[PDB]
C-alpha cells in the first residue's frame, strides 16, 4: 500500500465516471427511467462499497445504447481503493446523472485532501 | 413525519373525468418520485404511473393515452387526471412515495356509475403455526428492487420488506425476505392468526413497477 498508487487510482476513477457522464451528457429519457441507490454517508474510502454494489445495475443501464470495459475497469479500481463495511443507503434514489455526479463529487473530495 | 393523503370525488358519472389530489407532508416532491396505484374491489394491485422528481412522467401502457399526472412542488401536491372513464375504473386509488422504502397513502375510493413478475401460490390454506414460502420470479435481473406487502380487508397495503431482504421497522421478525437476481422469496415462520391476509410482491427496476398476482393466505 502507498500514497502514490492510491492517489493515481482515485484520479483514474474520477476520470472514468466523467467519461460515462459525458458519453450520455451529449434513448436518454429511457435511461433516466432507472433509479440508483445512494450512499447515506460517503466520506472515506471504505464507503466505496456503496459504489461497488451498484455497478451491475449501472452496466445494465449503459447497455441500452464500450460499457463492459469501462465498468470492469471501475470495478477493479473500486476494489483496490476500498481495500479489505456494510453499505448504508439513503432513502432518496437518484437517476444515473444524479448518481454519477454524487460519486464524481466524492472522488474530488478525497483527492484534494491527499 | 411522512404523510400522503389522497382526496377524490367519491362518485363520478361515466362520461366525465376523474381528478384526484395527493397532498404530501414531511418531505419535498423535489427529492422523491410519486407513483399512483389502484385496486378494483376484490382484485389485485396495479401500477398506473409515476411522476419523477424532475417532473417527467412514465405511464402504464394500458392507460397512457387517457392519463395526465402533474404536480406542484411548492404546494406539495400531485394530481392524477383520468379521462374516458369506464365502470371498470371503480377502484381505491393510492399515491406512493417511491424511495428505497416505499411509503403509502391511505387510498381513496372512487366509484364510477416489460419485466413480468410471477408470484407463487395464488392461495395458501395453512394450519396455525406452520412455515410457508411465497416466491416472486422476474423475467430478468432486477438487482434486489423488490418489495413485499401485506393487505388485510378494508386496509391499505403494509410494507413488510424492501430492497428484497430488508425487514421494515415494526414488522415482526417472523417475516423474512431472500433471493437474488430474478427469484425472490418471502418466508413466514410459525404463522399466526394475525397473518391471515393477501400478500403481494412489487418490482421497481425500471418501469412499469409491476405487482405480482397476490397470495391469499388462510387458516384451513
**CATH architecture descriptor name of the largest domain in chain B:** Sandwich
* CATH architecture grouping of chain A: Up-down Bundle
Q: What integer value in Å does the Rg of chain A equal?
A: 14 Å
Q: Can you tell me the CATH topology of the largest domain in chain B?
A: Immunoglobulin-like
Oligomer: heterodimer
Distance between the termini of chain A: 15 Å
- Biggest interface and residues each: A-B, 15 and 18 residues
* % residues in beta strands of chain A: under 5%
Helix content of chain A: 55-70%
* CATH class category of chain A: Mainly Alpha
Q: What is the chain-wise order of helices and strands of chain B?
A: EEEEEEEEEEEEEEEEEEEEE
**The CATH superfamily title of the largest domain in chain B:** Immunoglobulins
User: What is the distance, rounded to the nearest whole angstrom, between the alpha carbons of the first and last residues of chain B?
Assistant: 40 Å
Total domain modules of chain B: 2
- Main sheet: strands, sense, barrel of chain B: 7 strands, mixed
The percentage helix of chain B is under 10%
CATH fold field value of chain A: Growth Hormone, Chain: A
- Count of helix runs of chain B: 0
Keywords (chain A): Adaptive immunity, Chromosomal rearrangement, Cytokine, Disulfide bond, Glycoprotein, Growth factor, Immunity, Pharmaceutical, Proto-oncogene, Secreted, Signal
Protein name (chain A): Interleukin-2
GO biological process, one term (chain A): natural killer cell activation
GO cellular component, one term (chain A): extracellular space
Amino acid at each position: 500500500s502507498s500514497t502514490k498508487k492510491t492517489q493515481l487510482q482515485l484520479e483514474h476513477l474520477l476520470l472514468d465516471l466523467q467519461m460515462i457522464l459525458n458519453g450520455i451528457n451529449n434513448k436518454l429519457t429511457r435511461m433516466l427511467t432507472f433509479k440508483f441507490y445512494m450512499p447515506k454517508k460517503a466520506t472515506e474510502l471504505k464507503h466505496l462499497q456503496c459504489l461497488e454494489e451498484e455497478l451491475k445495475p449501472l452496466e445494465e443501464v449503459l447497455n441500452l445504447a464500450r460499457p463492459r470495459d469501462l465498468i470492469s475497469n471501475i470495478n477493479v479500481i473500486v476494489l483496490e481503493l476500498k481495500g479489505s463495511f456494510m453499505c448504508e443507503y439513503a432513502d432518496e434514489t437518484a437517476t444515473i446523472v444524479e448518481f454519477l455526479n454524487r460519486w464524481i463529487t466524492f472522488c474530488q473530495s478525497i483527492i484534494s485532501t491527499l | 413525519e411522512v404523510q400522503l393523503q389522497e382526496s377524490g370525488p367519491g362518485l363520478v358519472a361515466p362520461s366525465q373525468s376523474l381528478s384526484i389530489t395527493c397532498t404530501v407532508s414531511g418531505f419535498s416532491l423535489t427529492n422523491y418520485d410519486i407513483s399512483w396505484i389502484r385496486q378494483p374491489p376484490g382484485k389485485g394491485l396495479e401500477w398506473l404511473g409515476v411522476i419523477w422528481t424532475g417532473g417527467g412522467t412514465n405511464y402504464n401502457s394500458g392507460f397512457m393515452s387517457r392519463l395526465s399526472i402533474t404536480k406542484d412542488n411548492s404546494k406539495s401536491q400531485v394530481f392524477l387526471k383520468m379521462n374516458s372513464l369506464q365502470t371498470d375504473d371503480t377502484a381505491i386509488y393510492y399515491c406512493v412515495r417511491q424511495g428505497r422504502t416505499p411509503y403509502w397513502g391511505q387510498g381513496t375510493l372512487v366509484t364510477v356509475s416489460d419485466i413480468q413478475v410471477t408470484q407463487s401460490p395464488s392461495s395458501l390454506s395453512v394450519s396455525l403455526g406452520d412455515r410457508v414460502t411465497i416466491t416472486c420470479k422476474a423475467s430478468k435481473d432486477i438487482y434486489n428492487r423488490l418489495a413485499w406487502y401485506q393487505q388485510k380487508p378494508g386496509n391499505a397495503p403494509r410494507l413488510l420488506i424492501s430492497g428484497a431482504t430488508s425487514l421494515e421497522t415494526g414488522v415482526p421478525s417472523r417475516f423474512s425476505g431472500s433471493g437474488s437476481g430474478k427469484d425472490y422469496t418471502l418466508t413466514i415462520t410459525s404463522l399466526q392468526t394475525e397473518d391471515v391476509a393477501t400478500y403481494y410482491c412489487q418490482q421497481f427496476w425500471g418501469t412499469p413497477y409491476t405487482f405480482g398476482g397476490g397470495t391469499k393466505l388462510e387458516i384451513k
